[PDB]
Amino acid sequence: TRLRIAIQKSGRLSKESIELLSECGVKMHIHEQSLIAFSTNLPIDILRVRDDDIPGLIFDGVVDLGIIGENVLEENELERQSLGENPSYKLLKKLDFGYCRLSLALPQEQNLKDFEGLRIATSYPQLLKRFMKENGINYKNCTLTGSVEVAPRANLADAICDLVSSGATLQANNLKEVKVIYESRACLIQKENALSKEKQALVDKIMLRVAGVMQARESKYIMLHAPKEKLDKIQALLPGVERPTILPLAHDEKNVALHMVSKENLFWETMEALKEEGASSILVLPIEKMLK
Template sequence: MLDNTRLRIAIQKSGRLSEDSRELLSRCGIKVNLHTQRLIALAENMPIDILRVRDDDIPGLVMDGVVDLGIIGENVLEEELLSRRAQGEDPRYFTLRRLDFGGCRLSLATPVDEAWNGPAALDGKRIATSYPHLLKRYLDQKGISFKSCLLNGSVEVAPRAGLADAICDLVSTGATLEANGLREVEVIYRSKACLIQRDGEMADAKQQLIDRLLTRIQGVIQARESKYIMMHARPNAWKKWLPCCRAPSGRLFCRWQATSSAWLCTWSAAKPCSGRPWKN
């Protein structure tokens, strides 16, 4: 059995968010071997257990208190939330923060040779989807009646196979839709990955570890948005070479390089060039 004193984090075993989730944990300094077939991996340097599961199991594991944290797409989280509410449940969890990966959109798509004059064109039609509750919420708000065809994969083939008149599925680039003779006609939900926490009491040691982890995640995300510039330059020469950049954030470090007879200056530029002249 798992040790209840250790922080449990659920991530997707394989799929769209798997690699980015593993990279995020690694960049946060969590040393754990996630390149094996083991479904539970123990961190070497922190009291953390990583559970590798199906993405649609993660919201339930968090809501039911089996794990403490989960990294999941907002689309999967919202679908599970709507499903449980439809069954009369009152699911509880906290969204700690939105992450900077896993961006996608849930869209309606129809055959390319069919006219589209808005959602009303779907009235009375059969729509294939893996997200029946998100689809129902959207079309109910539009006052559109429809028939749902639940598929857990290969949703794009449904119109050609005669299973449905249209589909509602995740879209990243649209290439898969195009390959199956479909076109994206309406976005009904936009999603990114997010970090969620279970409801209920949390041991002080666990909560402190979560707070530390959140600080590291913020640092990782901020670092991805930053640029590190290193150049050989004499002091004050950078204003001529980088006239569009703002003053460097943090301290500037310069030292004389005897081997190259030049000054080596380094700094971290936290913001990209603004297009405006340099101002002190």
């Protein structure tokens, strides 16, 4: 049988989940009508489903791997625990996308006790519940799967417990963030029961590549020209991951090419200082995978 991986059918995670699988060498033809997309080059089946189903599919052993936000994973874990079940899974990797936080927020027109008795709208009723029990606060519930941010101005609720990627989003609905109750990111998870030897080996291969993809994010390959005499000064500004590669230029004994891996943001931050030190013809090139 083939390895089954469940990803979000469409949405935030979906594009990034697909891109990640593609960079890990999985080729597939995705038809928006089909539940499953079959890999053309590897024994892998990609299930594209509603995000909320993914944890359950992993807990129940229906699929082997899943990519899902920690928030959705924990919300569902809690729902199942409170129904008396014992869900389990293996965390393989916390990914570098899907960054967001779950925040209690009130109208700008302030404290945690100010939430006592309020109606609070959320898509994550279970995370909200646990947090309010732990802090001894009573409140009335209003579960909406979408458009939570509109609830207060539409007079459906007094406050919200909303997922945001940016502080500014709340301010732009005249809401003040009061307490962050959960921080999340996309994870790659695996079901509890051991896989067959061949499936596990395939998972291991994929993980090597996942690390390579993750390690390269935000990094670029920098090339420049400088006088040999300036090597030490430039190296101090742009050290590389180990040390600069040094390359001769044709018919030139005074100048060299230097190559270094750098985080893109650090490069821009020292770019003008590199020029002051005599660097010229500076190139930025992409890197798709990095292995330490």
